[PDB]
Design a protein around this ligand. Sequence first.
Ligand SMILES: *[C@@H](C)[C@H]1/C(=C/c2[nH]c(/C=C3N=C(/C=C4\NC(=O)C(CC)=C4C)C(C)=C\3CCC(=O)O)c(CCC(=O)O)c2C)NC(=O)[C@@H]1C
Ligand SMILES: *[C@H](C)[C@H]1/C(=C/c2[nH]c(/C=C3N=C(/C=C4\NC(=O)C(CC)=C4C)C(C)=C\3CCC(=O)O)c(CCC(=O)O)c2C)NC(=O)[C@@H]1C
Lengths: 319, 317
Amino acid sequence: KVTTAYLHHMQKGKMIQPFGCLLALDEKTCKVIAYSENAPEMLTMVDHPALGIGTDIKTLFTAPSASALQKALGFAEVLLLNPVLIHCKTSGKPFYAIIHRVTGSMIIDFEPVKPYEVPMTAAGALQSYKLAAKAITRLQSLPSGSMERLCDTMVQEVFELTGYDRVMAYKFHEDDHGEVIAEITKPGLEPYLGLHYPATDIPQASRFLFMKNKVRMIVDCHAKHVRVLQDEKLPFDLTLCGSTLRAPHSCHAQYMANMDSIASLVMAVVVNRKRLWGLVVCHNTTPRFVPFPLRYACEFLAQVFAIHVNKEIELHHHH
Amino acid sequence: TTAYLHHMQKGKMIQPFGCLLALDEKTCKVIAYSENAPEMLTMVDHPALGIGTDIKTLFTAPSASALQKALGFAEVLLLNPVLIHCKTSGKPFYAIIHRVTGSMIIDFEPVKPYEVPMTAAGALQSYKLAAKAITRLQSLPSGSMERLCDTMVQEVFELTGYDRVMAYKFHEDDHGEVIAEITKPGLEPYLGLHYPATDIPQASRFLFMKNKVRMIVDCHAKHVRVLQDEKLPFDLTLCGSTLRAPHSCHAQYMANMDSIASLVMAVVVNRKRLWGLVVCHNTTPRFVPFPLRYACEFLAQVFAIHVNKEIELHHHH
Ligand SMILES: *[C@@H](C)[C@H]1/C(=C/c2[nH]c(/C=C3N=C(/C=C4\NC(=O)C(CC)=C4C)C(C)=C\3CCC(=O)O)c(CCC(=O)O)c2C)NC(=O)[C@@H]1C
Ligand SMILES: *[C@H](C)[C@H]1/C(=C/c2[nH]c(/C=C3N=C(/C=C4\NC(=O)C(CC)=C4C)C(C)=C\3CCC(=O)O)c(CCC(=O)O)c2C)NC(=O)[C@@H]1C
């Protein structure tokens, strides 16, 4: 009755963050069946309009960019290699396109790229993964035996990789209440280390979605949300909660503003079936954007952290 | 010794899969170019490309200013590769940058133009595969150099797609041994074969300490000459170039052994010495993009750390 009122509205994810724009394409036609209201301003310059229900993507993007998104329409979810660098046809404006699939639909998140970054996209993708891979080797070379030193290491490595003001390891107890068991902040900041938080601060609906979306980013909790519009011929709502752009629930948004955490990056810590052990939670006291390549690299660092956590659990229950 | 080093340094030949420019460390103008650079970068007064060419006339403006930026950064701060576009064609290359005394050296490796959208994605996937391989090396139980080496050649085989991958160990007398090997089915195994120290001379062994990954696309390809301004106050070395051509003796050696292509990773243990090489061979030509060779560099460093540990745990017990 509480899980199903939150879950219905998050799963539809009809409100996005304005740092990016969203398209949904029909797998058969390759045409637009849903768009964020900012997508026309972001992807075109202001018949048809340039961008609505039925728009062909050969009108929006340069020919190699349109052809790579058309080819993505033929791949299993698991075989998608993100992100795709696309260019808009008129402006030459660049974006990272992040693709995911929901049955016959292909959902694209567009995150702008500074045009001076275009030449360095492979270079910066490699550097982000290298730095994460080095963090992985420091986690592996720790002596076994201490959940505390493993979590301290992780928040130190994530703090240096992501540049956020605060990074904590947030553990879920048996009763679903949480505890901050590791923490590093910049010098001004109030410490949360060792505090315990009620289960209802993180409802089951968010818990469920972190099993599937392993990295969630909120750029600015005070940003004006943007509405996604869908094809009126669809007799159900599209599921958009897989979007990197999904807006926080208004209650979480206020919770963030309350706590002076304007921005956040959260990585799911899933142990082997599967359990959500906890979250790696990064906060910023001002707005913050990190590009897809670095959030991708963080996914893998978080999966390796999950493996080491689960081994420290097995070495608790032995000894 | 100094006869091999003169010819692999000063030789001035590159492999034709790419082209080379050297730019003066202050003017940022061309002081050396491979003879294929004009056709490959311009679609062949002044010509479009010679000694003195300004890079602003060869590449689009964002491409030229990403190179101008590298000109002001220490070798240690260089993030490779830069994606560049040629000015009229829009033809794209990976530009791999390294510094010598007077100069910035750029290796240009072609990118299929319809693959430009997938460059970041392909780079992340190459590193992710290598990162997964790293976690499989670390989760091995200690005690077995054989299991350590078998794993490495299996991970390198699945990452690079070559016909054959071997771990080649240097003995105390510098002769080599194939101690691990994975091939595609139907190939003769070279596992356990011992080869003389002269098959890999000191010269090559020295240079693998500095250049950790070396690719030869086709041992039969026609080498292309690098031309420099004869007034340049030093000789350009190409030892650091990804494009450097193999000595004609190695190229014959490869053809004899039915390895038309190779990819070799130095295994350096701690002072430092060259423990061995991870050697990939192919029966036909093979090109692998820079991101994948870069990710193999890190995988090979990590393998070297675990090799070194199995050595210390042998000395113990
Ligand atoms: C309002 C009705 C109730 C509520 C709702 C709510 N919470 C979330 C999600 C999250 N809540 C937290 C909580 C914390 N962040 C912290 O830093 C700390 C201190 C350590 C806590 C306790 C977190 C991390 C999340 C995940 C949010 C993310 O995506 O980064 C949601 C889901 C929001 C969404 O749309 O994702 C909701 C609806 N929270 C309350 O406190 C009220 C009781
Ligand atoms: C010619 C007069 C002599 C010679 C010279 C030579 N060898 C190399 C470099 C390499 N040689 C090997 C040898 C092997 N490759 C194999 O697959 C095997 C079987 C396991 C062996 C023993 C290798 C791996 C290299 C590295 C080549 C590379 O750079 O990828 C060189 C250097 C070539 C260059 O220009 O870099 C030279 C000059 N080889 C002979 O057999 C003659 C005695």
